[PDB]
Design a protein around this ligand. Structure first.
Ligand SMILES: Cc1cc2nc3c(=O)[nH]c(=O)nc-3n(C[C@H](O)[C@H](O)[C@H](O)COP(=O)(O)OP(=O)(O)OC[C@H]3O[C@@H](n4cnc5c(N)ncnc54)[C@H](O)[C@@H]3O)c2cc1C
Length: 440
């Protein structure tokens, strides 16, 4: 009766939540697999996370699922103490990972500026614009201004040198998984607020702990709890959501009647679906301009065991590259994040070699792999990140469509929005509660 579009984390957890409340549901998934932008897959000799990777116990929704499905002790920290390299004025600088972290720590203090005024409750990100806001008017003005400033310009305006600017550039190429100069600085400030306003905590939460058994241990766990079979290979083509009741049409023409529809399709893929009535104009403007996520994630295998960390600014093929696994055949698998999916072929050994050559032309790539989410018609983006203006006139506009259609997904979460599975688990669950409450 409730139709859930998409079997990623948000759709899976919404279905489990409805099952708890005794509400009949059905999940329709376009692909032949579940998990969405989380995807644990055997590649290059071991299970690799082609999408979501890192978790932390300060992520309430992710951590509860880790506890639920038996993964409490099945987390391992990524390699640290790497030999660090960074590109600044066309030159490669070498240093310790500590050197690099201290530079970013100093830059983040200026980058998080204002988070204490904006985000006393970091899970109420739009409090400053609410009628309950009781702070000075200049805080609201600065808040709105910060939505139109990118995170790098904050560091430039504070007077940091070019070396730190280039490091911060590289860092936010990865963090905005796209052009950081078009991004909203409020995204970075909320990450600060969710991380006790300390760089080390923010990196602990988003870039440290991996699941030994992969994200699939969690999404297969949730799917295993569902008493209703997921309909794979069943793309939705149209959603009707007039007051009478909702209707969903698949690509094959099958029409399914619904009491409500929970749509977890990401903005980058929403143009595949015809909505009747059409979505609100402000929602359509976000879909047309999408979100800040045009980048890509690579896994590169090189010869030898090397503890490597590399940073490079836009327009590098990859902006952050780090050792992750030391393999038994004397090779290293590194992970990389780059701002532009169209400037990198994730499966081309020569392209991966060009990435490594940004820092060290003496290392030799022997294999490489990745999934270009942006070119995937069922995603059309990497993790959701915010362009200028989308913190206050972006992710929040997808709530309160009507009583028949509800949008759920990490990209609309109040907390760790877009960048984390925590946001998908948050928003899938609370959107199911919206339906439960309406039905009660
Ligand atoms: C490269 C990358 C790395 C990441 N790393 C991390 C990380 O380290 N840690 C972390 O916490 N998070 C990470 N994430 C974020 C995490 O993957 C997402 O926040 C989360 O998986 C999104 O869940 P969702 O259910 O909201 O969306 P999705 O997973 O996109 O689910 C939507 C589902 O709908 C399906 N679908 C699309 N169109 C249709 C249609 N027309 N009909 C039917 N089904 C359709 C899709 O196939 C998909 O299964 C990463 C994301 C990316 C892209």
């Amino acid at each position: 009766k409730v139709v859930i579009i998409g079997a990623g984390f948000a759709g899976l957890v919404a279905a489990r939540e409805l099952q708890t409340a005794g509400i009949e549901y059905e999940i329709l998934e376009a692909k032949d697999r579940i998990g969405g932008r989380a995807w644990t897959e055997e590649r290059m000799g071991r299970p690799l996370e082609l999408g979501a990777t890192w978790v932390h116990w300060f992520q309430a929704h992710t951590w509860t699922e880790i506890m639920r499905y038996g993964q409490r002790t099945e987390i391992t920290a990524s390699p640290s103490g790497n030999d660090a390299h960074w590109v600044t004025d066309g030159k490669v600088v070498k240093g310790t990972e500590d050197d690099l972290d201290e530079k970013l720590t100093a830059a983040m203090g200026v980058t998080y500026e204002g988070s204490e005024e904006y985000f006393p409750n970091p899970h109420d990100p739009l409090w400053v614009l609410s009628d309950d806001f009781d702070g000075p008017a200049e805080v609201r003005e600065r808040f709105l201004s910060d939505d139109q400033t990118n995170a790098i310009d904050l560091v430039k305006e504070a007077g940091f040198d070019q070396e730190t600017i280039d490091l911060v550039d590289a860092f936010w190429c990865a963090g905005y998984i796209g052009d950081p100069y078009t991004g909203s600085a409020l995204m970075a400030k909320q990450w600060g607020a969710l991380s006790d306003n300390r760089y080390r905590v923010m990196e602990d939460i988003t870039l440290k702990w991996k699941l030994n058994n992969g994200m699939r241990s969690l999404y297969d766990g949730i799917a295993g709890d569902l008493n209703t079979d997921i309909r794979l290979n069943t793309p939705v083509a149209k959603v009707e959501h007039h007051d009478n009741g909702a209707t969903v049409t698949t690509e094959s023409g099958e029409v399914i009647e619904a009491s409500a529809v929970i749509c977890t399709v990401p903005v980058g893929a929403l143009s595949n679906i015809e909505f009747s009535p059409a979505l609100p104009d402000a929602v359509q403007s976000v879909i047309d301009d999408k979100w800040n996520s045009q980048g890509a994630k690579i896994w590169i295998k090189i010869k030898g065991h090397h503890r490597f960390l590399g940073y490079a600014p836009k327009p590098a093929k990859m902006s952050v590259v780090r050792s992750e696994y030391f393999m038994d055949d004397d090779t290293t698998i590194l992970v990389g994040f780059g701002y532009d999916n169209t400037n990198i072929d994730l499966n081309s050994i020569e392209d991966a070699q060009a990435v490594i050559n940004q820092w060290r032309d003496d290392l030799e790539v022997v294999d490489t792999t990745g999934h270009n989410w942006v070119a995937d018609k069922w995603a059309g983006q990497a993790w959701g990140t915010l362009r200028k203006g989308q913190f206050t006139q972006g992710w929040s506009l997808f709530d309160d469509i009507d009583s028949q259609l509800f949008f759920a997904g990490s990209d609309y979460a109040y907390g760790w929005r877009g960048v984390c599975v925590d946001g998908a688990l948050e928003k899938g669950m609370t959107t199911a509660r919206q339906v439960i409450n309406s039905m009660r």
